Amino acid sequence: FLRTPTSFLPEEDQGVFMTTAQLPSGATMVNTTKVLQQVTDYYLTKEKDN
Amino acid sequence: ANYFIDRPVFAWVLAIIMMLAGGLAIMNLPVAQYPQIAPPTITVSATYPGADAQTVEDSVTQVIEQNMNGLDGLMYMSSTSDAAGNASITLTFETGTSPDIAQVQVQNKLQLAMPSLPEAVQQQGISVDKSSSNILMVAAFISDNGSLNQYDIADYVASNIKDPLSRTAGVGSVQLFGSEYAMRIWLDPQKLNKYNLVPSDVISQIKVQNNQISGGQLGGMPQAADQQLNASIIVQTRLQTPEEFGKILLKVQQDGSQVLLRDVARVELGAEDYSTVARYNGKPAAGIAIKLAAGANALDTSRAVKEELNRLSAYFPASLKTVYPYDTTPFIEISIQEVFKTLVEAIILVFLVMYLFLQNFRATIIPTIAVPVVILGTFAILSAVGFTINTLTMFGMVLAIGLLVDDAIVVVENVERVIAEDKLPPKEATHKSMGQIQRALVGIAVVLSAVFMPMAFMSGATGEIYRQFSITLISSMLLSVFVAMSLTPALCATILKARFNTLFEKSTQHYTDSTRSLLRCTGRYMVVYLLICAGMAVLFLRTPTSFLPEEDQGVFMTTAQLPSGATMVNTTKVLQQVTDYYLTKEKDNVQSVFTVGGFGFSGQGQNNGLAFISLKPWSERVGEENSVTAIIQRAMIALSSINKAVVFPFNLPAVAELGTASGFDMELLDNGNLGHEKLTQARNELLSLAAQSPNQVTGVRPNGLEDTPMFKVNVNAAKAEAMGVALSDINQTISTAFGSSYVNDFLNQGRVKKVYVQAGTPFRMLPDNINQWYVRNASGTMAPLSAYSSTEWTYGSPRLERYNGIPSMEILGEAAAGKSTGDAMKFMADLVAKLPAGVGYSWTGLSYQEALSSNQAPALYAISLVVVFLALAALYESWSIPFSVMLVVPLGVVGALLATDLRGLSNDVYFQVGLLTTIGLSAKNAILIVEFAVEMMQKEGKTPIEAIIEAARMRLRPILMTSLAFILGVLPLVISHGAGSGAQNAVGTGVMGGMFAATVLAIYFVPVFFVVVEHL
Amino acid sequence: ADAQTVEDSVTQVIEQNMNGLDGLMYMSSTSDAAGNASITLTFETGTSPDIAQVQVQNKLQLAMPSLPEAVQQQGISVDKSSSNILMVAAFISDNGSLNQ
Amino acid sequence: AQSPNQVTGVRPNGLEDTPMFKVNVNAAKAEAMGVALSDINQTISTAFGSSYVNDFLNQGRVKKVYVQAGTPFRMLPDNINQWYVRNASGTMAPLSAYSSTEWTYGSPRLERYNGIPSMEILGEAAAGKSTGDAMKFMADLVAKLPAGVGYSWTGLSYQEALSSNQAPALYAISLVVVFLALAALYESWSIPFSVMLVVPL
């Protein structure tokens, strides 16, 4: 009873998830838009099956 | 039922469950001196800096009062408008209304009403507070070494103490006795004259330069493509140091010299509210008042707050101590400890009595374990219904202990008797005795519940105390019946086996021989009974009425009031005299004196002051010479020589309800159209007409302040406008100079603080100062203020008051001798009717509850009689028998009345609950005698006399055991004189004597009533 | 406004009053550099959200007089809703006529 | 970050300090030439920030009207040189005259938890470990930090920590309750022991 790890509730596959994209402080919306476009391209090409 | 006898393990498990639930209850249960008793109130406070009484009443008070409608459960609403610019509107809501709902309703109405108030009171903000009186602690902060003055300590306690606490459990209405820092700017009329400036220019430049400008963003959005930079812009920031406020550039002269604010004014980190001076033991200090919360624990909250102060005492800058004046926590702790001691001593005495009577350790072991089971179960029930452990509930349990003991004794005595005679084994004997007393026990439960419910169903302030008492008694009684039916029979089944005794047998034989004389003069006996009954009524018409006895809470308060128009210098002097007396001529008893001048209970002012006075712990003052009552009555005579003050010490009110059943509070509403002068003329017709008849009303004193001189400045608009100066400029410079002018906010040590502008101290203290200020024409020239304005010395009021939207006067009085409240509030009416036409009267606060529902007392005490009659008829299966169970209650009533009246008490609530307990016990004894008598009549054929005598002989011992145990249990309560002595004596002297008369007269009269009823 | 500007002139003012009302399990407060103050009080399980909002709003106007202007003609937005998105519904243009 | 076998992907839920433009306006120099400080402040604030002026009607709905400088005139530290402020006599003087621009540093987002500043942190547990192990590991990691910093679990962590302490007590009351129930149902104290000696199995 002391060797077992502790937890609250197991993780589940809810069918959705999120990704955050944080740029260096002082960057503008142009660079953030480019970064998010790269993220969208990766997800929509390399994960087109899921 | 009787199936627990065959299964002792079931009964033991139920007992263990009761004990566990009781322990879990007492571990987590709120403790307090008293529960919430006063009807919920909502207080609306508004501040108008510098406004008069009339100006406040005309602008802030009336507008707020006109839009307080649609509130549910609103009994009345009273408003006070001071001369310091404070308007306070209190709305009293009905009992049971949710205070949060009432607060939100009032605040929403005020939210919609706000745009009508002047900007100067809008800027301060109007505070709606769900809170009442009965401050918990007045913990104060003092300077040890020096340097730190009043304002510095007040600012520290406002900026790093008030907010860190007030999140503690049971703490929700913290009030301050100081004022946090501000950026007081003191103007100089001559320096302003030299540079051709006015306070308006100073205020405008402060508003312009002490501003927070939103710079925006370099870059920002929408942005062009190829934008790689995005930063904020800083343009300005609110000033922080007082040296920065002195560099504000008011103007630039043609010569080129710069005029700064420091050149026309003295800037200084001062205070916001300057009209409050707090001193601890003479030393200057500033403190806070912790008004507790609705649902609170009066003990652990105190420990947690003390621990918080110890924790954040290392953050204290230097030489700052954290003393605790007031602090009425030890009184609650001592009261609860004493009641627990009484409860345990009752069990010890009961065990001793059972040993001395039954003379069998096995026999006596049963109640000694059965009683704590019931006590713990009742604690669990009180926690399950949501009842806090306070003085009322514990003192109700003090009668409950005797009620449970009586059941335990009767069960054990019957089992012991049946194993004694008839040679029945313990189990068979237990079955026999329980068959004998089973339905009698349930009938007794019904009768006692019917006796106790009427007190449960009252309303108002009385209703809550009565509810606490009756809920406690009902829970304890109903649990005791079930436990006596379940736990006790198993214990008697498994425990008992196969000098004074001879004296008791001889006494019982003598009693039977004397009781046999029913065949001689029975009728005359009844006549005597009637006389006693009549005497009871006579006593019931002589005992005075009171609410609760005053206690030795350990602290009291003195109020020093200067006559009128008296400055803070004289008030501080008078309070210094008061604290010097209390700390040099009473040093043995008095520990601390915390004197706050300016803060009077009758209202803020420079002619008021109040001193909290603490006392050395009860372990250091003993007797009557060193109690609170004697201390205040010794100090009253000593302080009559305070040389122009009306200082008046007094003890803490019980729950702040009323001044005994003699005090009344009427208000003389003007109505019609008559003004304030014609209303004060009516108030002067009264206070004299009433004093002409001192047989009914004595202390008719006019609560409220009286007329004072007032300076009047008559500006001449025509001349001023003809020669160039607008009336706005004159009216603004006078107001800003003499009566403060909030400008904006600023940042100090990471905290937002106000900025004020006022005239210099020496330039606003005399009527000859007004002709020292100058105002600017349209062409830039400056002209004196005396060329326009004239001066007068008119008369005016310093504190106006209104009631329900009608100008009132608040005449409060007291009843004379034995004349009760009702005759007082009947004589004040029909005396108001003789006043000039227009004025009316209204009862408030104390008399209101007694002006809408008064017949709510006896209807349920007649319903109780009807219900108990029905229950008894069901028990005995006849209609005439219950009369000789009803004819026994006056026997206990008259005894309790005598034992109370001939010792020095009154008709307090504790007397009422003790009287009902004695009534219940007498009814139970009569029920149990008549039960055996009727069983003999209906089962083993006998005559109405031969059966009743045998029943009385059988029941002699249980009555003499329970009554003696109950009398001895409450005996130390009567003799106690320490902390909480009044409540102890009240729950003592009554029952101790009600029980004695009940037992003696019941055992000597029940056969007479039985014979008369059966033969009639 | 700036981050410190907001955190001192708006967040401090609103924060000066909410200390403990019914069940305050814990309190958070963020102040951005885009002019955004986001106090996020969290009460104990079983508290009535309506009563909690009532208490929060009856203690917020004890701080309202200390707030500046241009925070008013936009409006304070007390909310008792959840803090986590339940559903996002996006709207697009099929052919590409309407811009964002 | 250097202990990947316990905690993986620990990141802060906040924003880092940024450079910030600062403008200093000479009140004395401005007031000497007649241009008011209030007017300068208002022009700068409206140009680079915005100004909600009024409401108006669009397709039957009330919307807001905003005044701001154009996109090309709001982008560079030298753009502040193009704005002119009107004198008290009607003449226009450039804003670059009585002003000085510099750069400083400032935080773009300030946080507070329970009333004190905070730096809320996110991060998952490494493979093989559980959230309790990572929670304890980070509580240990905090102890090796400069004095003047604390740690507070919040959100899901609050409830997980509460449950971990709750459970053993709940086992205790459940065992005592089942013992008492058996003792009451069966009139004996033997079965309550012969049965309660089996729960470890």
Ligand SMILES: CCCCCCCCCCCCCCCCCCCC(=O)O[C@H](COC(=O)CCCCCCCCCCCCCC)COP(=O)(O)OCCN
């Ligand atoms: C077989 C018998 C022997 C074995 C018994 C075993 C029982 C063991 C444990 C018994 C103790 C628990 C049950 C006793 C009552 C406690 C629960 C009271 C709950 C409570 O607080 O309600 C009170 C109602 O008064 C009350 O006490 C309820 C009044 C109920 C109506 C009574 C008659 C009313 C008048 C009608 C006259 C006509 C006669 C009707 C037949 C007051 O309410 P609160 O404080 O919550 O409210 C506040 C706002 N007001």
Ligand SMILES: CCCCCCCCCCCC
């Ligand atoms: C098994 C029969 C027991 C005796 C008759 C029932 C008595 C009920 C009394 C009132 C309820 C406890």
